[PDB]
Amino acid sequence: PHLGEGGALTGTARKAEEARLRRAEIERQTELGRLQQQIEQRRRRARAQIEA
Amino acid sequence: PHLGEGGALTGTARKAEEARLRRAEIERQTELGRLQQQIEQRRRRARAQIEA
């Protein structure tokens, strides 16, 4: 059975929709990872400054 | 025998001159030590900055 919104999709369209969902959710994960790395950088400067 | 400039000094004056010489040379040593510590400080900032 077709799972997810826009269930009318069938055939090649179903695979295309699956690929699009994978791409978008992957890039959302990349967004969150980049924010985490940003906070990483800020904390590094903070405690290095404390060391000085 | 009296050693050092102003050999005419005798009695208490000789001890006073010895004490004055000791004080002055000690403070010259303090001068040099303070300069060395200053360069100490500059080098510390330099390589800490390099670490960052």
Short mmCIF file of N, CA and C in Angstrom, two decimals:
data_model
loop_
_atom_site.label_atom_id
_atom_site.label_comp_id
_atom_site.label_asym_id
_atom_site.label_seq_id
_atom_site.Cartn_x
_atom_site.Cartn_y
_atom_site.Cartn_z
N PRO A 1 0.82 -1.21 0.00
CA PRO A 1 0.00 0.00 0.00
C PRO A 1 0.85 1.26 0.00
N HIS A 2 0.35 2.29 -0.67
CA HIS A 2 1.03 3.57 -0.75
C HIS A 2 0.93 4.27 0.60
N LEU A 3 2.08 4.69 1.12
CA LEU A 3 2.16 5.35 2.42
C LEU A 3 2.74 6.75 2.23
N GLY A 4 2.15 7.72 2.91
CA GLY A 4 2.58 9.09 2.78
C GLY A 4 1.56 9.93 2.03
N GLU A 5 1.70 11.25 2.14
CA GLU A 5 0.79 12.16 1.47
C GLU A 5 0.92 12.02 -0.05
N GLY A 6 -0.14 12.41 -0.75
CA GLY A 6 -0.17 12.29 -2.19
C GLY A 6 -0.14 10.85 -2.66
N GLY A 7 -0.98 10.01 -2.05
CA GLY A 7 -1.00 8.59 -2.38
C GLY A 7 -1.41 8.29 -3.80
N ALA A 8 -1.97 9.27 -4.51
CA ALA A 8 -2.39 9.03 -5.89
C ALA A 8 -1.22 8.65 -6.78
N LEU A 9 0.00 9.04 -6.40
CA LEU A 9 1.18 8.72 -7.20
C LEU A 9 1.32 7.21 -7.37
N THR A 10 1.65 6.80 -8.59
CA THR A 10 1.82 5.39 -8.92
C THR A 10 2.88 5.25 -10.00
N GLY A 11 3.50 4.07 -10.06
CA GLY A 11 4.51 3.83 -11.08
C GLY A 11 5.79 4.58 -10.78
N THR A 12 6.37 5.18 -11.83
CA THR A 12 7.63 5.90 -11.67
C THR A 12 7.48 7.07 -10.71
N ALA A 13 6.28 7.66 -10.66
CA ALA A 13 6.06 8.81 -9.79
C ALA A 13 6.27 8.45 -8.32
N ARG A 14 5.90 7.23 -7.93
CA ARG A 14 6.12 6.80 -6.55
C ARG A 14 7.60 6.76 -6.20
N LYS A 15 8.43 6.20 -7.08
CA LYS A 15 9.87 6.18 -6.85
C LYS A 15 10.43 7.60 -6.82
N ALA A 16 9.96 8.46 -7.73
CA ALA A 16 10.43 9.84 -7.74
C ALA A 16 10.10 10.55 -6.44
N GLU A 17 8.87 10.36 -5.94
CA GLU A 17 8.48 10.97 -4.67
C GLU A 17 9.32 10.44 -3.52
N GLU A 18 9.60 9.14 -3.51
CA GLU A 18 10.45 8.57 -2.46
C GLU A 18 11.83 9.21 -2.49
N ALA A 19 12.41 9.34 -3.69
CA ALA A 19 13.73 9.95 -3.81
C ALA A 19 13.72 11.40 -3.34
N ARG A 20 12.68 12.15 -3.72
CA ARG A 20 12.58 13.55 -3.29
C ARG A 20 12.48 13.66 -1.78
N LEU A 21 11.67 12.80 -1.15
CA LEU A 21 11.57 12.80 0.30
C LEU A 21 12.92 12.50 0.94
N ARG A 22 13.63 11.50 0.41
CA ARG A 22 14.94 11.17 0.96
C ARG A 22 15.88 12.36 0.88
N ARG A 23 15.92 13.02 -0.28
CA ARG A 23 16.81 14.16 -0.46
C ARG A 23 16.49 15.27 0.53
N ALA A 24 15.21 15.62 0.65
CA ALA A 24 14.82 16.73 1.52
C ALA A 24 15.12 16.44 2.98
N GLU A 25 14.78 15.24 3.46
CA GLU A 25 15.04 14.92 4.86
C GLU A 25 16.54 14.85 5.13
N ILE A 26 17.32 14.36 4.17
CA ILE A 26 18.77 14.36 4.31
C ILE A 26 19.29 15.78 4.47
N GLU A 27 18.78 16.71 3.66
CA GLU A 27 19.28 18.07 3.75
C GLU A 27 18.83 18.75 5.04
N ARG A 28 17.67 18.39 5.57
CA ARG A 28 17.28 18.87 6.90
C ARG A 28 18.26 18.38 7.96
N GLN A 29 18.66 17.10 7.87
CA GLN A 29 19.68 16.59 8.77
C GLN A 29 20.97 17.40 8.65
N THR A 30 21.35 17.75 7.42
CA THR A 30 22.54 18.57 7.22
C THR A 30 22.39 19.94 7.89
N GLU A 31 21.21 20.54 7.77
CA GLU A 31 20.93 21.80 8.47
C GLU A 31 21.23 21.67 9.96
N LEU A 32 20.63 20.66 10.60
CA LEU A 32 20.80 20.51 12.04
C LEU A 32 22.27 20.27 12.40
N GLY A 33 22.96 19.44 11.61
CA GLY A 33 24.37 19.20 11.86
C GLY A 33 25.20 20.47 11.78
N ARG A 34 24.92 21.32 10.79
CA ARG A 34 25.67 22.56 10.66
C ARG A 34 25.44 23.47 11.86
N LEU A 35 24.19 23.57 12.33
CA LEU A 35 23.95 24.37 13.53
C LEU A 35 24.72 23.82 14.73
N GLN A 36 24.73 22.50 14.90
CA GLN A 36 25.48 21.91 16.00
C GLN A 36 26.96 22.24 15.90
N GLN A 37 27.52 22.16 14.69
CA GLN A 37 28.93 22.51 14.51
C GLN A 37 29.19 23.98 14.82
N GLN A 38 28.24 24.85 14.47
CA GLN A 38 28.37 26.27 14.79
C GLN A 38 28.49 26.48 16.30
N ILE A 39 27.61 25.83 17.05
CA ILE A 39 27.66 25.98 18.51
C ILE A 39 28.97 25.39 19.04
N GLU A 40 29.42 24.29 18.44
CA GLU A 40 30.75 23.73 18.65
C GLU A 40 31.82 24.82 18.61
N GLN A 41 31.85 25.56 17.50
CA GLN A 41 32.85 26.61 17.31
C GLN A 41 32.77 27.66 18.40
N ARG A 42 31.56 28.11 18.72
CA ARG A 42 31.42 29.15 19.74
C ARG A 42 31.95 28.67 21.09
N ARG A 43 31.62 27.43 21.47
CA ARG A 43 32.10 26.91 22.75
C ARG A 43 33.62 26.79 22.76
N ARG A 44 34.21 26.40 21.62
CA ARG A 44 35.66 26.31 21.56
C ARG A 44 36.30 27.66 21.85
N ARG A 45 35.89 28.71 21.12
CA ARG A 45 36.45 30.02 21.45
C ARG A 45 36.23 30.36 22.92
N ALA A 46 35.02 30.10 23.46
CA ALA A 46 34.74 30.50 24.84
C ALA A 46 35.76 29.91 25.80
N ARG A 47 35.96 28.60 25.76
CA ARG A 47 36.80 28.01 26.79
C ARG A 47 38.29 28.21 26.48
N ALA A 48 38.66 28.38 25.21
CA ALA A 48 40.05 28.75 24.93
C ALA A 48 40.37 30.13 25.50
N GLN A 49 39.43 31.07 25.34
CA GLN A 49 39.59 32.39 25.94
C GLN A 49 39.72 32.29 27.45
N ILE A 50 38.92 31.42 28.06
CA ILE A 50 39.01 31.20 29.51
C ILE A 50 40.40 30.70 29.88
N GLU A 51 40.96 29.81 29.06
CA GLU A 51 42.29 29.28 29.33
C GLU A 51 43.33 30.40 29.34
N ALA A 52 43.25 31.30 28.35
CA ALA A 52 44.18 32.43 28.32
C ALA A 52 44.05 33.28 29.57
N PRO B 1 92.98 45.54 53.27
CA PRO B 1 93.04 46.76 52.45
C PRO B 1 91.68 47.14 51.90
N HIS B 2 91.46 48.44 51.78
CA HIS B 2 90.21 48.97 51.25
C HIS B 2 90.17 48.72 49.75
N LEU B 3 89.08 48.11 49.29
CA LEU B 3 88.89 47.78 47.88
C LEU B 3 87.66 48.50 47.35
N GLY B 4 87.77 49.05 46.16
CA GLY B 4 86.68 49.80 45.58
C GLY B 4 86.97 51.29 45.54
N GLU B 5 86.19 52.01 44.74
CA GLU B 5 86.37 53.45 44.62
C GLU B 5 86.07 54.14 45.95
N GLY B 6 86.64 55.33 46.12
CA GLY B 6 86.47 56.07 47.35
C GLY B 6 87.11 55.38 48.54
N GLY B 7 88.36 54.92 48.37
CA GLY B 7 89.04 54.19 49.42
C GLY B 7 89.30 55.00 50.67
N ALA B 8 89.14 56.32 50.61
CA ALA B 8 89.38 57.15 51.78
C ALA B 8 88.44 56.79 52.92
N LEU B 9 87.28 56.21 52.61
CA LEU B 9 86.32 55.84 53.64
C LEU B 9 86.94 54.88 54.65
N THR B 10 86.67 55.12 55.93
CA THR B 10 87.19 54.30 57.01
C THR B 10 86.19 54.27 58.15
N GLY B 11 86.26 53.21 58.95
CA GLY B 11 85.37 53.10 60.09
C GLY B 11 83.95 52.76 59.66
N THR B 12 82.98 53.44 60.28
CA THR B 12 81.58 53.18 59.97
C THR B 12 81.26 53.48 58.51
N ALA B 13 81.97 54.45 57.93
CA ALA B 13 81.72 54.83 56.54
C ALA B 13 81.99 53.67 55.59
N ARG B 14 82.99 52.85 55.89
CA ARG B 14 83.27 51.68 55.05
C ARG B 14 82.10 50.70 55.04
N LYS B 15 81.55 50.40 56.22
CA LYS B 15 80.39 49.52 56.28
C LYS B 15 79.19 50.14 55.57
N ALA B 16 78.99 51.44 55.74
CA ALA B 16 77.87 52.11 55.07
C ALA B 16 78.02 52.02 53.55
N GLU B 17 79.23 52.24 53.04
CA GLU B 17 79.46 52.14 51.61
C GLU B 17 79.23 50.72 51.11
N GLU B 18 79.67 49.72 51.88
CA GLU B 18 79.43 48.33 51.49
C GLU B 18 77.93 48.05 51.40
N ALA B 19 77.17 48.51 52.40
CA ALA B 19 75.73 48.29 52.39
C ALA B 19 75.07 48.98 51.20
N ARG B 20 75.50 50.22 50.90
CA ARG B 20 74.93 50.94 49.76
C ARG B 20 75.22 50.22 48.45
N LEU B 21 76.45 49.72 48.29
CA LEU B 21 76.79 48.97 47.09
C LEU B 21 75.92 47.72 46.97
N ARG B 22 75.74 47.00 48.08
CA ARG B 22 74.91 45.80 48.05
C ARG B 22 73.50 46.14 47.61
N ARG B 23 72.92 47.20 48.20
CA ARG B 23 71.56 47.58 47.86
C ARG B 23 71.43 47.91 46.38
N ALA B 24 72.35 48.73 45.86
CA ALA B 24 72.25 49.18 44.48
C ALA B 24 72.40 48.02 43.50
N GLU B 25 73.39 47.14 43.73
CA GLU B 25 73.58 46.02 42.81
C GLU B 25 72.40 45.05 42.89
N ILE B 26 71.83 44.87 44.08
CA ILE B 26 70.64 44.04 44.21
C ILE B 26 69.50 44.61 43.38
N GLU B 27 69.31 45.93 43.44
CA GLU B 27 68.20 46.51 42.69
C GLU B 27 68.45 46.46 41.18
N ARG B 28 69.71 46.53 40.76
CA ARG B 28 70.02 46.30 39.35
C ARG B 28 69.63 44.89 38.93
N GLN B 29 69.94 43.91 39.78
CA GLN B 29 69.50 42.54 39.51
C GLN B 29 67.98 42.47 39.38
N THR B 30 67.27 43.19 40.25
CA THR B 30 65.81 43.22 40.16
C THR B 30 65.35 43.82 38.83
N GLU B 31 66.00 44.88 38.38
CA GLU B 31 65.71 45.45 37.07
C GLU B 31 65.79 44.39 35.98
N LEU B 32 66.92 43.68 35.92
CA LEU B 32 67.11 42.69 34.86
C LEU B 32 66.07 41.58 34.96
N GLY B 33 65.77 41.13 36.19
CA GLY B 33 64.76 40.11 36.36
C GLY B 33 63.39 40.55 35.87
N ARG B 34 63.02 41.80 36.15
CA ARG B 34 61.72 42.29 35.69
C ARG B 34 61.66 42.34 34.17
N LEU B 35 62.74 42.78 33.52
CA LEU B 35 62.74 42.76 32.05
C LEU B 35 62.58 41.34 31.52
N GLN B 36 63.28 40.38 32.12
CA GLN B 36 63.15 38.99 31.68
C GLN B 36 61.71 38.50 31.84
N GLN B 37 61.07 38.83 32.96
CA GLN B 37 59.68 38.44 33.16
C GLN B 37 58.76 39.09 32.14
N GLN B 38 59.05 40.34 31.77
CA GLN B 38 58.26 41.02 30.74
C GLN B 38 58.31 40.26 29.42
N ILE B 39 59.52 39.87 29.01
CA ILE B 39 59.65 39.12 27.76
C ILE B 39 58.95 37.77 27.88
N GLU B 40 59.04 37.16 29.06
CA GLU B 40 58.24 35.99 29.44
C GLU B 40 56.78 36.17 29.05
N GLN B 41 56.18 37.26 29.54
CA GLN B 41 54.77 37.53 29.29
C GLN B 41 54.48 37.65 27.80
N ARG B 42 55.32 38.39 27.08
CA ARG B 42 55.08 38.56 25.65
C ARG B 42 55.12 37.23 24.91
N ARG B 43 56.10 36.38 25.23
CA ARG B 43 56.18 35.08 24.57
C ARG B 43 54.97 34.21 24.90
N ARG B 44 54.48 34.29 26.14
CA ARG B 44 53.29 33.52 26.49
C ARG B 44 52.11 33.91 25.62
N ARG B 45 51.80 35.21 25.55
CA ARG B 45 50.71 35.59 24.65
C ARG B 45 50.97 35.10 23.23
N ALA B 46 52.21 35.26 22.73
CA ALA B 46 52.48 34.89 21.34
C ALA B 46 52.09 33.45 21.06
N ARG B 47 52.60 32.51 21.86
CA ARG B 47 52.37 31.12 21.50
C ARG B 47 50.96 30.66 21.89
N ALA B 48 50.35 31.29 22.90
CA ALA B 48 48.94 30.97 23.16
C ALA B 48 48.06 31.39 21.98
N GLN B 49 48.33 32.57 21.42
CA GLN B 49 47.62 33.02 20.23
C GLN B 49 47.83 32.04 19.08
N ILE B 50 49.06 31.54 18.93
CA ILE B 50 49.35 30.55 17.90
C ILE B 50 48.50 29.30 18.11
N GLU B 51 48.35 28.89 19.37
CA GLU B 51 47.55 27.71 19.68
C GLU B 51 46.10 27.90 19.23
N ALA B 52 45.54 29.07 19.52
CA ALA B 52 44.17 29.35 19.08
C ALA B 52 44.06 29.28 17.56
#
